Amino acid sequence: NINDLKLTLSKAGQEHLLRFWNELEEAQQVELYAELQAMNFEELNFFFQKAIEGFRMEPVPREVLGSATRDQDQLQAWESEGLFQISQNKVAVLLLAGGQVAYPKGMYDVGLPSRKTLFQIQAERILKLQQVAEKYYGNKCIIPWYIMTSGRTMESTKEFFTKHKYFGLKKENVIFFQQGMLPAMSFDGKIILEEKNKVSMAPDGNGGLYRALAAQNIVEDMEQRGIWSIHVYCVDNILVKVADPRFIGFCIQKGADCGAKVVEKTNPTEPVGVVCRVDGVYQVVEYSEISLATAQKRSSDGRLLFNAGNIANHFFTVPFLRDVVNVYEPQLQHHVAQKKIPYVDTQGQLIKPDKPNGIKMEKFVFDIFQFAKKFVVYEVLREDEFSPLKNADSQNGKDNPTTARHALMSLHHCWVLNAGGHFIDENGSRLPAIPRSATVPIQCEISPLISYAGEGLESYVADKEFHAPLIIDENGVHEL
Amino acid sequence: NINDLKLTLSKAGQEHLLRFWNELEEAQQVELYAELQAMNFEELNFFFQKAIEGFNQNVDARMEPVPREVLGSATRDQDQLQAWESEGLFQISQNKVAVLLLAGGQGTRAYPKGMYDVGLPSRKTLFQIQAERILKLQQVAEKYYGNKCIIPWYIMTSGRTMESTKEFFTKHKYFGLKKENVIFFQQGMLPAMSFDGKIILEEKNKVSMAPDGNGGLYRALAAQNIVEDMEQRGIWSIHVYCVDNILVKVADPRFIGFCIQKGADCGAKVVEKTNPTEPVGVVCRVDGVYQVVEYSEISLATAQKRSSDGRLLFNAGNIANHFFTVPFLRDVVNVYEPQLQHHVAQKKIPYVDTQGQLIKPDKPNGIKMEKFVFDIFQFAKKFVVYEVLREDEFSPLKNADSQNGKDNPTTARHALMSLHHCWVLNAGGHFIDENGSRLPAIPRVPIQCEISPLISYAGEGLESYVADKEFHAPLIIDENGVHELV
Ligand SMILES: CC(=O)N[C@H]1[C@@H](OP(=O)(O)OP(=O)(O)OC[C@H]2O[C@@H](n3ccc(=O)[nH]c3=O)[C@H](O)[C@@H]2O)O[C@H](CO)[C@@H](O)[C@@H]1O
Ligand SMILES: CC(=O)N[C@H]1[C@@H](OP(=O)(O)OP(=O)(O)OC[C@H]2O[C@@H](n3ccc(=O)[nH]c3=O)[C@H](O)[C@@H]2O)O[C@H](CO)[C@@H](O)[C@@H]1O
């Protein structure tokens, strides 16, 4: 009934979306029909009005902040609690892989000696933890893997996992669900058409996880499995400690329903959100929203006042995710981005604007921190846990495939030295820990199945010397 | 003669160098003779003997953190900044400050690193930006004490760069400086030497040579009489700095006033090291004497050691920015330099075999010896350390086989723009959309901003060009004023 739809669009001020209906082959016009019939126009106008209608900080109290380095007298207790939580099948992990090289970032092969993709590395960190848990508690156990993907990448991501046999995990325990979308809209409040037959659409931000969880009953799935803790994380960090027993133990022990892992920000303009509290309410002030004066404040000790860098690693309990889906979600606000958005004009010409065209609305995953009953912050070291792959080209600065590769290999290289091993050149001369910039860097990779975080390596490496590239995996020690 | 040389080579066991002598054209024979002639074979044998001991069969155990009593900070002590800076500008006005650039190293994208063009909207090379900061300080000190003044630029070159460099300055009219004040001198060299202690020929007529390390600065000063040229100019302070740092604050008045005000003969500028494996030397004290333990000579356990406050115990990263008083140099050049030791590196050295065949080994076959410039800190009457922030003063441009995602031309470009972008927001300025929507300080596009040292040395004096004005990047602010490249 397209008479019914022309009418509801025109009342919403969007009849221009059918401007070319008569120029579309029957196939075309049914793709557009079903795409429009699936939009909540009343709601999009409300969202637009609040977005358009749009237009002091304090560090968290030391009482809520734990440190992997300063509270090392506690790492053991925390690690035991997380492995214990894992062995009880009480822990699940949720990967934010929406909004993706026009391919899923988890497929990125960084040039590691073993050529593993980010998806595989993550899967093996999950397999490892299941195995360490069993070794320490005796029972077989499961850490389910919830993967939120975008429409464009759902099928391709699934095929990729089938091709790789789920990296050794069971399909039964990997749950794929997709993120929602939102249309781009010009400054006049009209939805933008990408083509004569397609609305310019984009993922609703990683904060669209909440509406996505709801739409596919993911929480009920977690409840059915009896999961208590969810480790939410970003796909681009090759160093990500998936289901990290320490971070989780910490949160369980401090009785939190919500936690965020953090690293110290030292460069005032590093594009990292900053965890803090405003009017007693916890949140992240996204880097694109801090003033330079604040980003630059320093405390007595010489460091930045706002130095708790969000590395997009959160802990959420299931009942809390339950409250968010059932109550808080509608209260989250859209963060706005003015963008140059390709569009078909009224004259049927395809335009690539040079002046920002309209806005993109996104919800942020960390905006539910303000609703948590008990929020904690966990600080870790950068070199051990955070090396984001943000831009594939090495000409956008850092955070590219080659910095991620060296970040992982440098870490593994240090695990070997700390476990008593050494690297040598062709004559058997020992290389130093940081060899001169050719007056290699050392190629080293250790499978997560062998070492989750540097432990269990003495029997393979103590007092031994290796010629890089060195890989230590399930099949032993190999110098390529 | 040749039996002169020939005999010297035999006492030395370096006879094989004339192996191809009777097979060289007159031109070739003169090139080699000259090369061999400028070499101290008996000494080289002694250096090799000392360098090779480094393999036999421990500084780390004796290393101690820099004590608080010698450490000054641009952050923790900003209240003393105005004083240090005017003190520094005073020395510059008094004509008592010279700058010395270490540029005998190479670069390969094969040419002087100083000649690199990083993609800045102005396109200036590192050499130019430095000369402009030197020009700047001269205008500022004049327009602050009333007299014209000079910051002489001594530039240590190597057999590699010398020619290329000189021609480049001449081509650019010394960027506005006066050539009588840009003193080029040449660094010495050392031959590659195999493990058996034999000097390596790279051609039948060419000894395989390389610059003797930035520490080769000291014999270099004595050879070309540089210390005397400095004394004849009435220079008291010398700012020694690395060529590859695009943010380098040449003849930095604050750093200079700090050391002079604290009465030092020697000072090092450092930045906080946070990553254990960052390749920067670390300033430290060993047996009551200051040293820099180079990144390649520290153990991982030391590099990773933390202090109670959570930062690296050895966090004073060396940025190759030093302060030496001319008298201290005096003593170094003619009293202490013989105690400097060579740091060694095993290398794969292309060589010519006994039958004339050029070979490229797949295994290291010899060593390279180098002296390091900071190894004189230990001889100082009073050593001082001055901590400064990375983003304002340190963004190294290293060789391609030493970047690995960073410390490259593009990160160097991003560091100068980010700094200038920030200097602008701090002076009340703002950047905007094509629609004029004001951009955040850190948009989610790398805001291209470039301010000339002539307009601003460290972010000062921009209020007029910038307070309360919005700008369209890319933005360039130079002598000819404010420019928007659209
Ligand atoms: C909103 C948010 O989290 N911002 C954080 C994110 O910012 P940043 O802006 O860098 O990254 P993005 O929010 O765009 O993306 C981060 C993660 O979110 C996912 N994603 C993104 C958009 C989307 O619609 N759907 C989706 O699932 C990506 O797959 C990725 O896993 O990482 C930084 C660390 O590197 C943190 O310091 C920032 O505070
Ligand atoms: C010996 C030395 O200074 N090491 C420092 C240098 O090491 P790094 O390894 O970076 O560099 P190099 O020791 O090769 O020397 C860098 C500087 O020295 C010059 N040069 C080098 C060799 C030579 O024979 N002649 C010469 O003039 C180069 O032109 C450049 O100006 O910079 C780092 C900062 O990035 C510091 O943390 C290191 O402690």
CATH number of the domain within which B451 lies: 2.10.10.100
**Rounded CA separation B267/B384 (Å):** 5
Q: Is the CB of A365 under 6 A from ligand 1?
A: yes
Q: Among residues B443, B442, B435, B444, which one has the least CA distance to residue B470?
A: B435
Q: CA A383 → CA B39, B295, B422, distances in Å?
A: 46, 17, 27
Which residue, A237, A228, A262, is CA-closest to A247?
A: A262
Regarding whether B183 and B34 lie in a shared domain, the answer is: yes
Q: Are both B156 and B25 inside the same structural domain?
A: yes
Do A56 and A204 fall into the same domain?
yes
Using CA coordinates, name the residue in chain A closest to B280: A434
Neighbours of B375 (CB within 10 A): 23
> What are the beta bridge partners of residue A146?
A94, A175
At residue B99, what are phi and psi to the nearest 5 degrees?
-115, 145
Asked whether residue B84 falls in the same domain as residue B180, the answer is yes
Residues B200 and B129 in one domain: yes
A390 is in an annotated binding site: yes
User: How many angstroms separate the CA atoms of A397 and A87, rounded?
Assistant: 42
Phi, psi dihedrals of residue B70, rounded to the nearest 5° = -105, -5
- Residue A265's alpha-carbon distances to A60, A164, A382, A478, B304, in angstroms, are 15, 37, 9, 37, 19
- Given A420, A448, A472, the domain boundary residue is A420
* List of residues 6+ apart from B240 with CB closer than 8 A: B100, B101, B102, B217, B320, B321, B322, B323, B324, B373
Nearest residue to A251 via CA among A314, A318, A308? A314
CA distance B467 to chain A (A): 15
Do A411 and A470 lie in one domain? The reply is no
Nearest CA distance, B75 vs chain A (angstrom): 6
Q: Tell how many helices (H) and how many strands (E) occur in chain B.
A: 15, 25
Convert B117-182 into a string of H (helix), E (strand) and C (coil): ECCCCCCCEHHHHHHHHHHHHHHHHHHHHCCCCCCCEEEEECCCCHHHHHHHHHHCHHHHCCHHHE
Among residues B428, B443, B475, the one where a domain terminates is B428
Method in brief: X-ray
How many other C-beta atoms lie within 10 A of the C-beta of residue B456?
20
For residue B141, give its domain range: 1-428
| Number of inter-chain CB pairs under 8 A, A vs B | 134
Which-ligand-closest: CA of A310?
A: 1
Residue A287 marked ligand-binding: yes
Breaks in chain B (C to N over 2.5 Å), named by the residue before each, are 57, 109, 444
Interchain contact B54–A (C-beta under 8 A): no
- Which site among B75, B280, B293, B300 would you substitute to test the A interface, given the most A Cβ atoms closer than 10 Å to its Cβ? B300
Which of residues 379 through 408 in chain B touch A, CB cutoff 8 A?
390-391, 398-399, 401-402, 404-406, 408
Q: Is the C-alpha dihedral spanning B101, B104, B107, B112 positive or negative?
A: positive
Answer whether A308 contacts ligand 1 (Cβ < 6 A).
no
Region of residue A420 (left: phi > 0; alpha: psi -120 to 50; beta: else): left
Torsion of CA B252, B254, B258, B264, to 10 degrees: 10
Tokens read off for A376: 């904690």
8 A C-beta contact, residue B335 and residue B381:
no
Known binding residue B294? Answer is yes
In this structure, the answer to whether residues B401 and B423 fall within a common structural domain is yes
Q: Quick one: closest CA in B to A358, which residue?
A: B435
Strand order in the sheet with B481-484: B449-451, B475-478, B481-484
| Measured CA distances, B323 to A61, B70, B98, B102, B234 (Å) | 42, 14, 10, 13, 16
Considering the domain architecture, whether residues A428 and A416 belong to the same structural domain is answered as no
| Cβ contact A32:A197 at 8 Å | yes
Query: Is residue A313 within a helix (H) or strand (E), and if so which, with residue range?
Result: strand A308-317
Residue of B300, B435, B446 lying closest to A417 (CB–CB): B300
CA-nearest of A67, A64, A66, A74 to A375 is A64
Quick one: DSSP state of residue A245? H
Burial class of B115 by CB neighbour count within 10 A (0 to 12, 13 to 18, 19+): middle
E-strand stretches of B350-410: 351-352, 358-359, 366-370, 383-388
Q: Within an 8 Å CB–CB cutoff, is residue B276 touching chain A?
A: yes
- Helices and strands per DSSP (H, E), number in chain A: 14, 25
Instruction: Check chain A for breaks (C–N over 2.5 Å) and list the residue before each, or none.
Output: 55, 100, 439
Between B418, B425, B433, which is nearest A338 by CB?
B433
Report the relative pairing of strands B266-272 and B383-388 from DSSP bridges.
Answer: parallel
Q: Are residues B440 and A288, on separate chains, in Cβ contact within 8 Å?
A: yes
Chain B residues lying within 8 Å of A289, measured CB to CB? 440
CATH number, residue B197 = 3.90.550.10
Please give the resolution of this entry in Å, rounded to 1 decimal.
Answer: 2.4
Sign of CA dihedral A285, A288, A291, A292: positive
Q: Of the candidates B224, B237, B226, B212, which has an alpha carbon nearest to the alpha carbon of residue B154?
A: B226
Residue B319 CB–ligand 2 contact under 6 Å: yes
Q: What is the DSSP letter of B188?
A: -
Name the domain count of chain A: 2
Cβ A273 under 6 angstroms from ligand 1 = yes
| Type of residue at A254 | K
Same domain for B436 and B355:
no
CA–centroid distance for B32 within its chain: 31
Strand partners, A465: A422
The set of residues, in sequence order, having a beta carbon less than 8 Å from that of B32 and lying 6+ positions away, is: B17, B21, B24, B205, B206, B207
Residue A250 and residue A218 in one domain = yes
Picking from A400, A420, A440, the residue at the C-terminal end of a domain is: A420
B-proximal residues of A, 211-270, CB under 8 Å? 264, 266-269
Q: With H, G, I as helix, E, B as strand and everything else as coil, classify residue A472.
A: strand
Measure the CA–CA gap between B241 and B155, rounded to whole angstroms. 10
Which residue among B303, B304, B404 places its CB closest to the CB of A441?
Answer: B404
Give yes or no: residues A196 and A291 share one domain.
yes
State the amino acid at position A75 in one-letter form.
L
Task: Indicate whether B485 and B341 sit together in one domain.
Answer: no
